[PDB]
């Protein structure tokens, strides 16, 4: 038995979010489904639970009538709805099944659902070339890349030469700026001897804004 | 704050033992069983111990649990680098009528060799300058332990405004990466002879310098 959760959500403060959790290769039986979250740089926090066959729910006191947990026995899917969202609610939300014979331990967990709560609005990135510069003169190596600036929300994907270039590629985790927008860089380590002849194109995809950008990275001139 | 108290950090030597404590009260640990979870952010938590001291199938006998009074402990013997993770205790609380978790303990396994950061600094692109912005990009990789401090300079003068630096992130090779961005106006960029990014790691500094292209 596996637990499959719904995809990432991006919400504004004051809104409500509903995350699902579907039992795959099994049913809820007489077990409970619990919801546990983890905010960035914080520990696990229990939100509440439900025993679907008996319709009994239990909620964490710190969530004062903000959380609603439901389930439908027909499709073996449980739900967690969190209302009046605040920036502090940005977290990964997990569902887990308990096991009465194991003193109600959470033995099976879903993969987690990221919920981002922000006042920012969707924005496709501005992509800028980072012209080749010397990395190791003795090694005859250069670094070139692309700056993927000011986008929202995560994620973006970066490929080089439509995926034909993978060796020496390092795409760095994004910075979250005070502006509420993200920026990242992707750098390729290449031989300096190849610079006058080899083409380097970075391909940037930002599905949330339906943005696809290509950027040729040529030697500085 | 978590109702079960755990130390925020623990450290152990490869091949040796480490103990992680969990302190509670009469309504939780005092009356109920304790469960332990291992977690690496980016993956779901994994059940390690249930019913105070029982291992689920697939959990090595190196992990053991115990409970005494209002406290519980997780012991890890023959420590392996793969044990580096966060460890959480949990118990039902009769007074709250709900589950309570400890704050978690980050376990460090002391084996790993120290590695100096590799630093790449890029100046603003002509395209970005044409868009009336100027971003300097400092990329830091392959350092261990996972902590660095970044200092930026305009010629030789320190610059604190317009600096945004990421927290270090673990790479595939178990070393760490970070990046630092300095936002300037085209005027500020063109007004100095150069800018520098200085990365300090374990007291030692690695510096890169860039300058406008005339």
Author numbering:
A (entry chain A): 2 to 222
B (entry chain B): 1 to 214
The authors write:
The Plasmodium falciparum reticulocyte-binding protein homolog 5 (PfRH5) is the leading target for next-generation vaccines against the disease-causing blood-stage of malaria. Here, we examine a panel of human monoclonal antibodies (mAbs) to PfRH5, isolated from the first clinical trial of a PfRH5-based vaccine (Payne et al., 2017), to define critical mAb epitopes in atomic detail. We identified a subset of mAbs with neutralizing activity that bind to three distinct sites and another subset of mAbs that are non-functional, or even antagonistic to neutralizing antibodies.
The two most potent mAbs (R5.016 and R5.004) had EC50 values comparable to the most potent anti-merozoite mouse-derived mAbs previously described (Douglas et al., 2014, Ord et al., 2014). High-resolution structures of unbound R5.016 and R5.004 Fab fragment crystals were also determined, with clear electron density observed for all CDR loops in the bound states, facilitating determination of the complex structure. R5.004 binds PfRH5 toward the tip of the “kite-like” structure, contacting the N terminus of helix 4 and each of the three loops that link the converging helices at this apex of PfRH5. These interactions are mediated by five of the CDR loops of the antibody, with only L2 not participating. In comparison to previously studied murine mAbs, R5.016 shares much of its binding site with 9AD4, while R5.004 binds to a distinct epitope which shows some overlap with that of QA1 (Wright et al., 2014).
